[PDB]
Amino acid sequence: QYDYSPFCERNTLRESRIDSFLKAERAAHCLVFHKYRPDIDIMCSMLLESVPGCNKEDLERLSRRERLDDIINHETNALKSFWNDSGLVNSLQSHHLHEEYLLLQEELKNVYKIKCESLRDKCRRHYSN
Amino acid sequence: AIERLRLWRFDALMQHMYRTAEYIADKVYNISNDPDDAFWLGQVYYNNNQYVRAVELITRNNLDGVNILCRYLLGLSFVKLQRFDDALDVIGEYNPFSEDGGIKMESSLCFLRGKIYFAQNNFNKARDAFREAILVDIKNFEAFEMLLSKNLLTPQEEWDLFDSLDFKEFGEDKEIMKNLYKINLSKYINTEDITKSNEILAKDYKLADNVDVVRSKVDICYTQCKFNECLELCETVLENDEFNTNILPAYIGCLYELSNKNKLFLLSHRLAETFPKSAITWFSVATYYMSLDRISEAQKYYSKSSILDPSFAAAWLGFAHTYALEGEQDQALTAYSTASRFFPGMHLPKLFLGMQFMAMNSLNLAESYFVLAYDICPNDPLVLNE
Amino acid sequence: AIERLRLWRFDALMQHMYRTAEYIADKVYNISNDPDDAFWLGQVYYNNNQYVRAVELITRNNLDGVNILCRYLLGLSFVKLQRFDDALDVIGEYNPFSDGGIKMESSLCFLRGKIYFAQNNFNKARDAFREAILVDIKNFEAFEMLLSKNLLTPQEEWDLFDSLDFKEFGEDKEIMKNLYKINLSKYINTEDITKSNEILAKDYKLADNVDVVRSKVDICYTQCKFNECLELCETVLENDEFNTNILPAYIGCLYELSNKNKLFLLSHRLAETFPKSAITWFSVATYYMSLDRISEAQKYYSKSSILDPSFAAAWLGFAHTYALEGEQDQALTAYSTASRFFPGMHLPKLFLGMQFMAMNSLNLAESYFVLAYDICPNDPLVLNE
Amino acid sequence: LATLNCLLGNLYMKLDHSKEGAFYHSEALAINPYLWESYEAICKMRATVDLKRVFFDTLPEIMYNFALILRSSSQYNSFKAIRLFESQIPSHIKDTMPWCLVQLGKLHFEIINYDMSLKYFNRLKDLQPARVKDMEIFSTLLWHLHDKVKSSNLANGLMDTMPNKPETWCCIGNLLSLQKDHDAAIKAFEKATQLDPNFAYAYTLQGHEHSSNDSSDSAKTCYRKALACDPQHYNAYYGLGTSAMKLGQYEEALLYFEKARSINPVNVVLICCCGGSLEKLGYKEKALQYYELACHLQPTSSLSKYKMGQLLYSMTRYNVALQTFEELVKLVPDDATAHYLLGQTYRIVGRKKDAIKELTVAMNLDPKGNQVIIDELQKCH
Amino acid sequence: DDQALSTIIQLQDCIQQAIQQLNYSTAEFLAELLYAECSILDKSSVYWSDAVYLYALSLFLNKSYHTAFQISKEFKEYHLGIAYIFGRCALQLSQGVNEAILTLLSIINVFSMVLNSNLVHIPD
Amino acid sequence: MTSEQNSNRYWNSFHDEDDWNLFNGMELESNGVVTFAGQETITGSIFDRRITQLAYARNNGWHELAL
């Protein structure tokens, strides 16, 4: 019988939640495992396996301590790293990539400014706070 | 030894000696880790309105499930505490046991499950739960009477279920208990049978003028609009019990239709001075306002009666009548629709929606609701006339 | 034939299907037509929280003169129906009589003592409770109620405990004598209570019993072992957080420890748990006292006092609110009221004498402090005062 | 030659890029496996290593189990971590260990299961009354539960113990936002962030309060500061997506929603928001894919089933739409607009008997719009 | 049981190793896990006192002075290092100095339970 | 208009304090959704049992912010 003890320390769980968790859990694993029961199984050189936005080539250069078609390759490549290998890009219409691209760096550049005083005046900030 | 303490605790509980019963239950449970003693202490906690303490008692040691009786007590404690989620949790969505001289333990669990489904407004599952509860043990009657009172089954279905169940458990008392059950069955179907049953019960046995038999006679007369027999039976039973809640709705309606304004006034005053909390008294006051043509005022009093007690057809129905009688017709539809949805299994709300839709001169929907009401109840002059 | 129906009625009572209970009680009563069946149906009505039905049913044929338990059920129904004079008239002011279970005469005497306690003739209540406990010792209420409200000074409580006999218990008197001895007052003969505590702890595995822990807590509270109060009452409260007997002592030793978070938590949980008990409002008032908000503690002690006329902590905390507020003339009347309602309680008199110091009136303070010291030879407050 | 790589990783993570810092944390772990701080720094991002080679090439197994737990929690797959807790990590470690209590409470909290998390790190709070680290999650849980007394407990206790810790002021602000006020919540959050910067949670709550205060620019700036403090934080991304939703510019809203979903794959709010951005963009076929993922990801959610029904009715997959709506009503009967779609699907399929009762429920739910319900009744027959 | 003692010794060695360098959060986690693991062992075991002392020292080292102060107050008498941690917490917080005095006076007078150990930061 | 108000009050005299407190500003709407006035609002659909105890809770129960 399906085990539900760890999902709630209360030894009894009403049957609605039993299938609610069971059907929830299986597809959650099915998403991770496929791009069955939980209790039967949980399983399944540079050490670093993955970094968000890092491809296999970028991992290799780390181990070494380091026109329309071409820009479309850069168009998709830019969104590959930022969207963490999202599969919806290939379904996007080509002219819909352009406006999302321009908003990417424009939003990105704003981060650079954010990420980057006379004696009498700058003493007040500590007094008032 | 311990048996003397146990029987002393049982008597103290029976004698409404709460402190001694609690003390001795605690002592006996400390002496022996017997779950029946824990059930007894939980019962003592239950009686004096100390529900959470009994909940924590039966929860702390996880002794529920070891024996079914404490599980039932715990579930009842939740259902009174209205934590219906936890009650359904401990009891279970369906029968877990599905393949002494007292009621079968499993049957009580199915009754509680039906009650919680009814509370959660899950009428469809509650019907099945109550049907299974009555089918498992005929010794049970709470589920049978609840289903009949709340009109959760059609009269034909009620008769079919009554015929399906047997009386083999009773044995010697088979015929008397069959008649006793048959008293409470719904009307509009083969009323002569309920008749001959109540006479055969009346003379043969000492139960000649008991409460339920006169109640059934009053119900028969009220259905048949035999209103003078209605009254005479009603006062002849009221003179013994001045506050018998089983008959009060029929009595109140029967006075309303005779328009005995004054007797209605005396009843309203007597019930107000005694039972302010119960919705019956406020229903009586509101129908007193009705008898004086005060629809706008007792609008509020039906609101009060309905809120003081949910699952009361009379209060909400009268509230909808107050909506429908004078103007403000648009929202009478919403009120009667609420009646239909929250009170499934009764033809009258559907019939009322149909006649109201006919009242807007909107026909086809009136036909729809009329045929719905006819489906719910086959034998009713009102629906067929409409 | 009737026996099956009687057992079915009993089962309906046990499993709390009240509508079937009353239905079957009515049926079996009409069949048999005996007063015991009417008693059963009246008991069903009582459990139904429908006292009017039960009392009318018992009185319609004047069954009170037939059996001895039906009249008691009618009397208790009147008791909870807020009717007292007719209740005593039915039961009778004086004793008309002067196997398992308990004797009925003791229960009737106990009910009479309850009515007298309701009617504020405290001496008659003491007489009734003493009579009930001496006639029957199984009636633990006649003991616990008498000892709870401090209706009598502890010396005569010990004397009556010694006077009453446990002989009719027999083989079980060996344990029940000690169990009853546990519940007496703690100021005097303290050591014997302790030895009884180890007696229960050994050979009876009752160390885990809640009331043994309650007795130990009250021992610790008497000599002001407030830290031990906290530790033991925390150990017992984890299992059960709403033992009404346990809670006031926990409030006392928490306020002594002067901590607001845990008092705060328990008070807010009890407020949503038991809205109509004076205990939670008393706890709220104590929390406000610990936060030195006297103005709110005023009202939140007044409500607790109104809810329970037998709640000495309420009156003394009330007069504490008065005294700490700044005005004392009303605190004088408050402490006098607390002293007069509860004869034999030294603390109201002691606090009243502290107030006499506060007014620089030492002449009454001498007598009041002597009276308080008469029964409290060793405690810091008395000697400090 | 193990702490130096850790220091390099910390500097890299702090300054510009977490990629090289993760590389150096991996190198440090290669030098020594018992550098749990490097593992925590790695798990701060969505980076993972091959634990079998790290920890092997019973204490190593125990450490490997905790590493798997932490990796799953960072990766946001809590069911597996709960299962390892059930199987491995014996109880006399699980219950006592405050850090496993924190993590396990987090794991139960990310699932809609709310009461068990409360119980778990409430026993934690009991064990360590003065613990201050990672109490903002308790504050968020109390905000979700709409409970005020326990939040008041937390606020008073933390203020008494640590008047200056940022978590205390964060909890004060969350309680304020709970009760009625938003400006005072903003003031508390700003005090919390001035006393200790680099706290992206305070900025996230600032942006949320600003959004609730109908101040778009301030919320955007607060979220930008949050991202500046923490590169990976789905809460501020979701807030930004919702803000661009309310301005109607669906492009950057989709951008933010997808970016938030990237680091937290299992969350139906973000899946639903990304899908809705998709329909506003017009991609019916791909939007369904996420919603198909969403309801299978977990049942008993009104939002996911509702949007399934809306999308299926839009492009007319009535056969599955009817059953999705049916189970929606089964899991909740109080949705007003849902029963309208129920009735529309019933009349389209051609089961008038169910259509009448469903529309009756519809008028019962919505007094104001009965007339249009009446019109559908007329269209029903 | 054969490997149970080895795990405790290894955890202790890792804790001293971590505290030897300026690595404190890892010291925190290892001290926490060792303290949790030692719960099953009886209080009479020297391992429990050693783990409690290491946990107290760590919780002091990361400025979480309150928590160190309680975790030291519970078992202040058992070990000398726990008393040292308690005294340091008391001096920083000005809370409960008196019992710190009552413990330190006794521990110094007796010296001139567990008193001597090979762990790090054991007071002289 | 005064007669009905007097009659309303005369019958309105028969309540418990908490019971009367529940119905001070009581209003029931046609569809069945309920509005409760706290002397906050407890708007909820009637015929579910838990709601009226919730109105009971905040009426007599002790609620407080504590900073």
From Swiss-Prot, chain A:
It is found in: Cytoplasm; Nucleus. It comes from the Eukaryota. The APC/C is composed of at least 13 subunits that stay tightly associated throughout the cell cycle: APC1, APC2, APC4, APC5, APC9, APC11, CDC16, CDC23, CDC26, CDC27, DOC1, MND2 and SWM1. Component of the anaphase promoting complex/cyclosome (APC/C), a cell cycle-regulated E3 ubiquitin-protein ligase complex that controls progression through mitosis and the G1 phase of the cell cycle. The APC/C is thought to confer substrate specificity and, in the presence of ubiquitin-conjugating E2 enzymes, it catalyzes the formation of protein-ubiquitin conjugates that are subsequently degraded by the 26S proteasome. This is Anaphase-promoting complex subunit 9. The gene is APC9.
UniProtKB/Swiss-Prot annotation, chain B:
TPR repeats lie at residues 1-32, 35-60, 68-91, 105-136, 141-164, 174-202, 212-240, 247-274, 279-308, 313-341, 348-376. Changing S305F: In CDC16-1; G2/M cell cycle arrest at 36 degrees Celsius. GO terms for biological process: anaphase-promoting complex-dependent catabolic process; cell division; negative regulation of DNA-templated DNA replication initiation; positive regulation of mitotic metaphase/anaphase transition; protein ubiquitination; regulation of meiotic cell cycle; regulation of mitotic cell cycle. The keyword Phosphoprotein applies. GO terms for cellular component: anaphase-promoting complex; cytoplasm; cytosol; nucleus. It is found in: Nucleus. Changing T154A: Abolishes phosphorylation. Phosphorylated by CDC28, which is required for the early mitotic activity of the APC/C in its CDC20-bound form. It comes from the Eukaryota. Keywords: Cell cycle, Cell division, Mitosis, Nucleus, Phosphoprotein, Repeat, TPR repeat, Ubl conjugation pathway. Belongs to the APC6/CDC16 family. The APC/C is composed of at least 13 subunits that stay tightly associated throughout the cell cycle: APC1, APC2, APC4, APC5, APC9, APC11, CDC16, CDC23, CDC26, CDC27, DOC1, MND2 and SWM1. Interacts with AMA1. This is Anaphase-promoting complex subunit CDC16. It comes from Saccharomyces cerevisiae (strain ATCC 204508 / S288c). The chain holds residues 229 to 638 of 840 of the full protein.
Swiss-Prot record, chain E:
It is found in: Cytoplasm; Nucleus. This is Anaphase-promoting complex subunit CDC27. It comes from Saccharomyces cerevisiae (strain ATCC 204508 / S288c). The gene is CDC27. Component of the anaphase promoting complex/cyclosome (APC/C), a cell cycle-regulated E3 ubiquitin-protein ligase complex that controls progression through mitosis and the G1 phase of the cell cycle. The APC/C is thought to confer substrate specificity and, in the presence of ubiquitin-conjugating E2 enzymes, it catalyzes the formation of protein-ubiquitin conjugates that are subsequently degraded by the 26S proteasome. The APC/C is composed of at least 13 subunits that stay tightly associated throughout the cell cycle: APC1, APC2, APC4, APC5, APC9, APC11, CDC16, CDC23, CDC26, CDC27, DOC1, MND2 and SWM1. Phosphorylated by CDC28, which is required for the early mitotic activity of the APC/C in its CDC20-bound form. Present with 593 molecules/cell in log phase SD medium. Coiled coil: none annotated. Belongs to the APC3/CDC27 family.
Curated annotation (Swiss-Prot), chain F:
One of its GO terms (cellular component) is anaphase-promoting complex. Transmembrane segments: none annotated. One of its GO terms (biological process) is protein ubiquitination. Keywords: Cell cycle, Cell division, Meiosis, Mitosis, Ubl conjugation pathway. Signal peptide: none annotated. Component of the anaphase promoting complex/cyclosome (APC/C), a cell cycle-regulated E3 ubiquitin-protein ligase complex that controls progression through mitosis and the G1 phase of the cell cycle. The APC/C is thought to confer substrate specificity and, in the presence of ubiquitin-conjugating E2 enzymes, it catalyzes the formation of protein-ubiquitin conjugates that are subsequently degraded by the 26S proteasome. Belongs to the APC13 family. The APC/C is composed of at least 13 subunits that stay tightly associated throughout the cell cycle: APC1, APC2, APC4, APC5, APC9, APC11, CDC16, CDC23, CDC26, CDC27, DOC1, MND2 and SWM1. SWM1 interacts directly with CDC23 and APC5, and is required to tether APC9, CDC16, CDC26 and CDC27 to the complex. This is Anaphase-promoting complex subunit SWM1. It comes from Saccharomyces cerevisiae (strain ATCC 204508 / S288c). The chain holds residues 78 to 166 of 170 of the full protein.
